[PDB]
Write a protein that binds this ligand. Structure first.
Ligand SMILES: [Cu+2]
Length: 221
């Protein structure tokens, strides 16, 4: 299934979310180029103004597009599960605030890589950093640490996302992550993904939205 990631692949992403009393929905469309580890997407909040900040959704909103160097192709679980795909479950702990629980299917549908996600958020403080919107519009660079568990024939991962706050603070988000294949036949040595993300806006776009450009490369061997 690494075959399927030579050349540009279009992308569709859908987020169904409930945080406390608010429901929201997000559609993303764009393309991904696994050959250089690049992502280009635009996101729309089809339900009005987001009750959370856009940066808090970035990680739950396709690591099959991580560029794996030639000498690491043995370790690319994400692609090797395609086209049938994989399940990606996360729990995300915002320090001294609420929590996200996310489930999502990442899989091919025609020539389009699809990420369909549902998200549950509980115990977020009103006038905390997430609700009441005190996060700055940007995104830091991280290392995503990946291990195999042969148990669920898949991939576990954890890492800490650092969210700049508008007063110089840093809101931390602890990510706990599992990945499980849907079909059959895919398991790496310990390694990581260095990430980079720029956020921006379409100035002629009136719906609450997010333009995102992202670079990712594997390393550790
Ligand atoms: Cu719903």
């Amino acid at each position: 299934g690494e075959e399927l990631f030579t050349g540009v692949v279009p992308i569709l992403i859908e987020l169904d979310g409930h945080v406390n009393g608010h429901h929201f929905f997000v559609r993303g469309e764009g393309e991904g180029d696994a050959t250089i580890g690049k992502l280009s997407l635009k996101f729309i909040a089809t339900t009005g103004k987001l009750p959370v900040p856009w940066p808090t959704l970035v990680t739950t909103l396709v690591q099959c597009f991580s560029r794996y160097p030639d000498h690491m192709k043995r370790h690319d679980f994400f692609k090797s599960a395609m086209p049938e795909g994989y399940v990606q479950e996360r729990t995300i702990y915002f320090k001294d605030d609420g929590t996200y629980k996310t489930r999502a299917e990442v899989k091919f549908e025609g020539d389009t890589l699809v990420n369909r996600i549902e998200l549950k958020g509980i115990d977020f403080k009103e006038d905390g950093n997430i609700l009441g919107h005190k996060l700055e519009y940007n995104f830091n660079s991280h290392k995503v640490y990946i291990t195999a568990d042969k148990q669920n024939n898949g991939i576990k991962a954890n890492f800490t996302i650092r969210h700049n706050v508008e007063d110089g603070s840093v809101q931390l988000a602890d990510h706990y992550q599992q990945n499980t294949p849907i079909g059959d036949g895919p398991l790496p040595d310990d390694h990581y993904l260095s990430t980079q993300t720029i956020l921006s806006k379409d100035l002629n776009e009136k719906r609450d939205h997010m333009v995102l450009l992202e670079y990712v490369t594997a390393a550790g061997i």
